[PDB]
Amino acid sequence: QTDVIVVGNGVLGLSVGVEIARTRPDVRVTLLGKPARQYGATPAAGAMLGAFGEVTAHALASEHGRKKHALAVQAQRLWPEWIESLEATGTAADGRIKTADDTVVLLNTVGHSALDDANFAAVLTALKEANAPHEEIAVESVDWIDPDPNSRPLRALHIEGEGSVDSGILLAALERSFLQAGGRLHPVDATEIRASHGRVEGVVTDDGDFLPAGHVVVAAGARSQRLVAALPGLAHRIPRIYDGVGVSALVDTWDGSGPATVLRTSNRAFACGLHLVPRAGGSVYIGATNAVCLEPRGAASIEETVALFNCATHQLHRGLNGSELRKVQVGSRPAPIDGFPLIGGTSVEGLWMLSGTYRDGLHMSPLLARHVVSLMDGGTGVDGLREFRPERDLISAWSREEILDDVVRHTMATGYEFPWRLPLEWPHMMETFLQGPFAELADRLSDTYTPPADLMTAIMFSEREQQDELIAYYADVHREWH
Amino acid sequence: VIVVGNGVLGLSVGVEIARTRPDVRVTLLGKPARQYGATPAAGAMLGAFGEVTAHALASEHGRKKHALAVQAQRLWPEWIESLEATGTAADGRIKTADDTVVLLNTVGHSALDDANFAAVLTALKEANAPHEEIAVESVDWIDPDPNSRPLRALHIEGEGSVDSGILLAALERSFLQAGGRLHPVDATEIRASHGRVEGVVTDDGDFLPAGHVVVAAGARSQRLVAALPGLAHRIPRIYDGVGVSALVDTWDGSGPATVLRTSNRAFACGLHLVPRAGGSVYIGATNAVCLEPRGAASIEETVALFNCATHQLHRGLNGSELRKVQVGSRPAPIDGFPLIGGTSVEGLWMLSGTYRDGLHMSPLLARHVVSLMDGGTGVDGLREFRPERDLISAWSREEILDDVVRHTMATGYEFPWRLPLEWPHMMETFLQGPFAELADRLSDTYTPPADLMTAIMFSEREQQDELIAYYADVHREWH
Amino acid sequence: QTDVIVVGNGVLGLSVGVEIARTRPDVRVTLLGKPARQYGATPAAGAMLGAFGEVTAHALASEHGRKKHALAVQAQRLWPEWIESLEATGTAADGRIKTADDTVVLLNTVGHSALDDANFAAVLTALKEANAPHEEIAVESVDWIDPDPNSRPLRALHIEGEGSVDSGILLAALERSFLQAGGRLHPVDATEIRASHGRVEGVVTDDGDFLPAGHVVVAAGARSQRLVAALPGLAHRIPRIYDGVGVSALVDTWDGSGPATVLRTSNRAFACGLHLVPRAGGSVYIGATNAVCLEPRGAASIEETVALFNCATHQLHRGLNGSELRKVQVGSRPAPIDGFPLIGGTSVEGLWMLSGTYRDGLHMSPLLARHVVSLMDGGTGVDGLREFRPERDLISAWSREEILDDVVRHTMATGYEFPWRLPLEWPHMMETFLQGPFAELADRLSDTYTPPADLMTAIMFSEREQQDELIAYYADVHREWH
Amino acid sequence: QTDVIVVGNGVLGLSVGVEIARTRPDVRVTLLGKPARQYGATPAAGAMLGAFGEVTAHALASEHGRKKHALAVQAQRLWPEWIESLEATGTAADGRIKTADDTVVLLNTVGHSALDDANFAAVLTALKEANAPHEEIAVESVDWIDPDPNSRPLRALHIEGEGSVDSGILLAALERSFLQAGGRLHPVDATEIRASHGRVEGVVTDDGDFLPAGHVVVAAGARSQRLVAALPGLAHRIPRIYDGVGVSALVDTWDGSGPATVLRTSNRAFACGLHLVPRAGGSVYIGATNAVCLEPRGAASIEETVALFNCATHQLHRGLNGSELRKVQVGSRPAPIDGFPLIGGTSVEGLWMLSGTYRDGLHMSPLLARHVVSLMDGGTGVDGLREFRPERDLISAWSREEILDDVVRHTMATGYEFPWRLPLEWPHMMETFLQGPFAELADRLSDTYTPPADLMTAIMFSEREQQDELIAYYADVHREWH
Ligand SMILES: Cc1cc2nc3c(=O)[nH]c(=O)nc-3n(C[C@H](O)[C@H](O)[C@H](O)COP(=O)(O)OP(=O)(O)OC[C@H]3O[C@@H](n4cnc5c(N)ncnc54)[C@H](O)[C@@H]3O)c2cc1C
Ligand SMILES: Cc1cc2nc3c(=O)[nH]c(=O)nc-3n(C[C@H](O)[C@H](O)[C@H](O)COP(=O)(O)OP(=O)(O)OC[C@H]3O[C@@H](n4cnc5c(N)ncnc54)[C@H](O)[C@@H]3O)c2cc1C
């Protein structure tokens, strides 16, 4: 066939489905996935069109991090026309995809100086280098916020043209745009990709059916590598993707008000962060926790709910304390084991992957969709996505020393972000006693690969059998690629 | 007979009527959504001794309410047997625990927690209830933060818990088995004339005729009857004691063998864990008196419930999965006591205003009202709690003003806050004047209990003025 | 006689004694006061040469406040030659009066936004208006500091040429300079100023002696008005001076190090503040608490010691935690009831006053000394110190409404500066319940006079009899002047 | 007659001096030490006549601990007649040695359950086994206390006949009683004990003099072993004594009141504890911190002052917050390296030691004095003090496993006693990461000796060179005794 099957109905699957359907009107594109969107990252997202807000000192200190940042800056330029093209298929009554145009990044002292101070400086530097319009503003000039004075910001950065979308209205607009362009929605899950003679034949679905295709695009979020790893050799050639389990909430504000901009901190301990995304109709979105889990989890923990609520009420608006909780949302950020996305072609003809985007796949979606569609048409797509090809040796973007410094810093940051109150000698004591055990873990896991801090903490506190299984995985990957 | 309401009280009275008068047709109103419903949000504890406070037992009305709770406990074993008998193994067990441990920690006000622990011990000794003060080290399962840990623990034997959801399912099943009819609509209006009930207009526009109407509509019960001539100032108002609770799947599927609880805390909230089947635990429960109904938890309520349970009961709950946040309205009577029995309108009955322990008292209250409807005298000590009455004044204005300041300070100590050491005394001195001024302004004769007085203090001027008018109209009607 | 008696041996008494002795070599000047310096402000002082560091929004919102600030800026220019003139009378072995040239003002969130944010902006504005050399600098560039990250500064302001002196070396240099200029030190206290026919005759001392004089200069710190109030009518003509009881400490640092600059916050709740003043020999000075007391107190409270130590260890340097406490110091800032100093002549011929300087008499001392000496010589002294003449109706520098707003703000700031951790509804509840009782107190005390916030809180929590005595005092002042 | 020199003027030196002078009319006794009492434990002590109040589960789990406890119970019986015999040499105007007859032990949650709950049970058990008069009482029945409700006791234990003395009045009474009995006070320090042919000749003093004697009793507190270690072989034969540096304070209460009983907790992290000892004249004593230091320290750290004040104001009486600080006191508890006292004779003829009594030498003083005086007269003194002879191999009273469990428990207790506020997973994480490094230190120090927890934490955080010097010391002790 020349038929295309997109496996997955998040932002990435639907974005690539829309681009394929619009640019190849001669081909039949079928998109799989159920309206429940189990473990789905996209429906749990605010979401911020985060490019500069996602900048950390640690990310920009590596070549792979600077490459990822460059792609985020490129994606931002596509959003205005992308939104126009999606709203064009609907009417006023469908709601607006865009919920804010601008972002304010706040700097408070409810966190580690080694993350928050370093990251604020890195955001300012990235904005200056990219010639992005921005201004450091008086905190008194930030509208709406009403923090606890002991939790208040002392610096604020207004980023112009870095905004937010309603993730639910975006998903509805993508489905509507996909159908308008001739796409077919088949609400079942793929169980298996069938291939032989190094070529895709199609997909077995969970209702027992077989769908033939010349092209299969896997955009199944955190399930994407588990689906492809079934094919010969690919188990140690496609980097593993884990569940970056994230908790967010929809709140009806006490007075129906909301801020005119996104409000956020820089990224905090183990890739969580605090933000408020404006919504229509007297609602605000607050996010968002992150915990890398070696198995999927579809429910918030008590700890996650309390940390999210406590940070938002103290650092953003005390009025949220008296506001009504409408929904606790949980989704899995696709967390790649080497810290970088899996975008492009495979050694299997007609097999494509769009996954492992962690915190900013939704932001990057229009760029990633256009990249993969260009490749499927025999083009070279977007420059700078080559290192993020899905079939690869694990990337080592940092030295083991850089990661060990990072994991101790992030561990200490879980204290400062709480925020804890301890005797003044205790933090230095904890730092000195954390270094040895993390160094020992890193040395034991592999002679060549080091997991990024977010994954390393999850491994440190996992069962012995899960640790031993990872040592075996790293050894098998090393064997395959060396 | 029409029963208006499908909580524990409506269904309990429906079951008793259907079982004891097989000759009469009983129809029970209410929707499966159970909007603002207290019963489905309840754990629930069969709380008699666990509900004891020094303040309650210092009043005659409080001691009378406590006596009825002790009496109700004796009915539960045969009541549960009679409800499970209409089902099979697959329906699950109503009883989830036989015993309760009351814990005393320092995450609260000495003026509430220390006084209330002593009052519970005294009530157990006076009632000859089986109990013993035990070593905290001997309490199984708990894993508190050491800075939030109990230093005293009290094991109460035969004071247990039921699964409120399995109880509601068992009551509906038992009601149908006894010939009851479930009509899933709400009453909009009780029709009466010549001082006699004719029946009920429903929200699908229909009219249902009846000689008897039993109102058990929880926090909506008085608003429904107040439409009838004169009754607006003769049936004490019932407000929403909005309560937040949660179902949690524990990290390891374990749970305690007993109820774990504190005594009642600031403005009639309290901390407890109720065992459930299938690796779930129930944690509760917040309380906030609202002058209007609210069906959603506030952020503050969720955080306080979770923070107290994780620190004071089990730190493992921190890593446990949140399955459900539950919200319900405890029917909060304006004079602090329930509304149980007959009316000046022939065939009009009320079962409401039970606040924290209607579910516990349900088998006793059901049998009381069914006896009255049969021309009996029901249960001896329920006469003062007749629904058509002047507002009860169970405490002096001075006792209530002391209580409201104590409870206000307890919201700090229960957080728990960390303040400069002069600040609490400063807050106490500056709280006394404004609460005394509010109490004096509201009425020359009536004083709302502390739980309601704080809600009135922080309500709009117009809501305060409407209450002054209500109290004046009640005084006019009864004096 | 043409003899001069200076009553008091603090910075003001000794500074005026030195200037009189140096400029009238024909007259005998005797200076009274004991080496114990009971309740003495000067020996408890760091001290900061604070002009811009003392700026608050509230002070600069009044004409009297702007006038006081102008005089502080003028005093700064006299310090270099004043220090030269004092060290000239000694040798290398006497040690250096100046301990730092520059000041860094730090902004953290361990306080009320309504004080700390407003005051930081006011300091920046005062520096810009005066064309003073200064720079807002990166907190990372502030040397030596090692704060708790949850208590850390996010903004820092370097003020050039605003420094510090060792108060003990200054007092020793002033005594030595006074003797070099022909002054006589008589270590007894004045019990009584004798006057008749509207003219000073001299001073009865506490050893029962009588010293004759044509001139008596009262610089007895917080005792100054109580001494002069004995003279006919002067009880209701010289504004009362109360004890601004201040606690400070000398600490030997863990490693003998100290910062190269003064480190300070702006003034905080009820005119306290946090600062570190460099000292020679591996010592640092930390200060300083403030509590207005209606009666003198010569000992620190436990609360004062804990608040001073807790703030310095968290907000400046955690290493101070392990440092050795050498001395807890207590002194009475002369706190004038109308908020302004008492400098110049009296209706009694030859009777002069130098007092009521509260937080910055030591800084202003060379200017105030030269002013009073000019007046004693028939000059007009320094322009703008005429409004601060000691014999006056009480100044009303602010509206009752401004003071009631200030006293509630400062009350709440005692919480935020602790810092407390409270349920988020409690602060607004406390603010609403504080307003009524402070308004009631202000209305009860007088129809015309309102005490500044620092004094109003002391009166609020004083005995009924002390309140009633103040109502009588205000009534008697009103009678005398209207 | 025959000369005796007592080296040291604390409770032990003066108690033995009084007993010798009273009982030995044949002997001339001279007692050395200065009125400054540098590093002196006794003047910094409250002091509690602590027998049952000093009970811990850990102490009573060892044979040596139970033996030490038995001696404390015996000492209590001597105090009434001892006090009579000392007050008899004075008049009413000298003041009363006894300040309280009874003690209340309070149990609150501002500490580790593994110390405070275990120790409360151990105190109850020791009282029941001894048939001591006591009762567990309602906290509401404890007079005077006004704790923060979040810091309040929930259990209280009244111990009858376990009281307190004023340490300053005791020292004055001992000096007066010593002089009345013919003792000579020579206010110089010993620099050197001279011996040859295995016999004491006398003492070189720090004024360069030599005093001849047949008998030298060393009771120089924490300096006792350093003084004798100069003599041949004795460096590895007299267990080292370190400085258990303790901070306490005298406070004038807001209203002149005080409690009628001692108020105390059981012993807390690394042998500190919280207590209030009644004093006459509107003063109370609060104590007391403890930190084992490898070198003497004569000044309180900021941390010590804050922890003492914070615990007393929260857990005992909030009124202490507004009370006046009269004195911060610092003294060195003589801390023996093997955890037990050094009482009795030496291999050097006429050389005796009374030291290493740590927390309860003052309580035991009448018993210890009578023991040593009996031995010096050719008696056998008190049964059960033989195991505490000063010339010995280091005692090993606990297994390495017991001490490693204890040191981790005590480390965690420094957090719970603060009290800290941390995320709920942090304590378990700290416990797991503390175990390895303490086990490694214990293994490195010696194959045979393990320092008790109080000393082990001091060694853990000492310089590498101090650790290496201790490894050498332990090796040299092993060589000498095996
Ligand atoms: C968080 C929480 C915890 C609790 N824990 C306990 C506990 O541990 N122990 C205990 O004994 N009790 C507990 N209770 C409940 C307490 O006992 C209540 O007083 C009791 O449940 C009230 O029962 P009810 O049947 O009167 O009211 P509800 O349970 O409110 O039932 C009233 C019903 O009437 C319906 N209704 C309303 N208007 C109409 C209408 N017009 N027509 C028809 N139907 C209508 C409502 O939708 C609702 O379903 C708890 C309650 C809450 C909220
Ligand atoms: C804060 C604190 C609280 C305490 N609380 C209690 C309590 O409640 N109950 C209790 O029973 N005990 C208490 N103690 C004391 C404890 O019992 C001690 O073990 C005991 O006081 C030790 O007495 P000592 O005479 O051996 O030593 P010290 O009291 O130290 O006396 C030794 C003396 O010898 C002098 N000296 C040193 N070197 C020389 C030299 N070369 N020549 C001459 N003199 C020299 C020193 O200057 C000093 O005065 C406390 C101690 C401290 C520090």
Residue numbers in the entry:
A (entry chain C), C (entry chain B), D (entry chain A): 10 to 491
B (entry chain D): 13 to 491
Sentences from the paper on this structure:
X-ray crystallography was used to investigate this complex enzymatic process, which showed Orf1 has two substrate-binding sites that sit 13.5 Å apart unlike canonical FAD-dependent oxidoreductases.
Our reasoning is that F316 stabilizes the planar imine glycine adduct through the π-π stacking interaction. The importance of this residue was ascertained by mutational experiments, whereby F316A brings on 6 as the major product (Fig. 2a (vi)). On the other hand, superposition of the F316A-ST-F and C281-adduct complex displays that the long side chain of ST-F is subject to a geographic effect, resulting in flipping of the amide group away from E312 to accommodate the entire aliphatic sidechain. E312 not only recognizes the streptolidine base but also ushers the β-lysine to crawl into the binding site in a compact manner. In this context, E312A is able to catalyze the formation of 5 and 6 but no more 8, as opposed to F316A, which catalyzes the formation of 8, the dominant product (Fig. 2a (v), d (ix, x)). On the other hand, given ST-F the reaction gives rise to N-iminoacetyl glycinthricin, where the terminal carboxylic group is retained and the N–O bond undergoes dehydration afterwards.
